[PDB]
Amino acid sequence: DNKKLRVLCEKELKNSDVGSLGRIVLPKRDAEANLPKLSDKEGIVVQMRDVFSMQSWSFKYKFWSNNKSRMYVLENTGEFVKQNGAEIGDFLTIYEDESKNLYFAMNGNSG
DNA sequence: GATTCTGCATGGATT
DNA sequence: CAATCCATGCAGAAT
């Protein structure tokens, strides 16, 4: 917890983000600019640690095809929301470690 | 059949 | 006017 952080993206949780589908949508602009570059629909597996804790979480960061561009999504978020009790309007903020791109990325509104 | 997963399409609101 | 973003609907696989 001697961490130095840079914000990569932030999302206001909507109904489907905390819904039964178990996936979280991320803003396309910031996801493309700051999140690792995705060159396949298969996506990648990313893990992000809580800023306030030593709890680490593993998600699948992938994209869907939409129109001629993309929609970015973070799959397998069911237990994350359930465990953290995230409701509509809560904030999921994703950060970055400065020397290493280790994805600290926690909710709990924060800011 | 009925139900859930998964990836894409639709459609309102905004850039 | 047309393009973009994204919440959600929804068709086809999988269970």
Q: How far is the CA of A21 from the C1' of B4 (A)?
A: 10
Q: Which nucleotide is nearest to A65 (CA to C1')?
A: B8
- Quickly list H helices, chain A: 28-34, 78-84
Handedness of CA A85, A25, A23, A100 (dihedral sign): negative
CA distance A107 to A5: 14
Identify the CATH number of the domain in which residue A65 sits. 2.40.330.10
Determined by X-ray
CB A110 within 8 A of CB A84: no
Q: Which nucleotide is nearest to A30 (CA to C1')?
A: C5
Full domain range(s) for residue A47: 1-111
Check residue A89 and report its DSSP letter: T
CB A92 within 8 A of CB A76: no
Q: Which nucleotide is nearest to A78 (CA to C1')?
A: B5
Strand partners for A12: A91
Q: Which residues lie closer than 8 Å to A36 by C-beta, 6 or more apart?
A: A44, A46, A61, A101
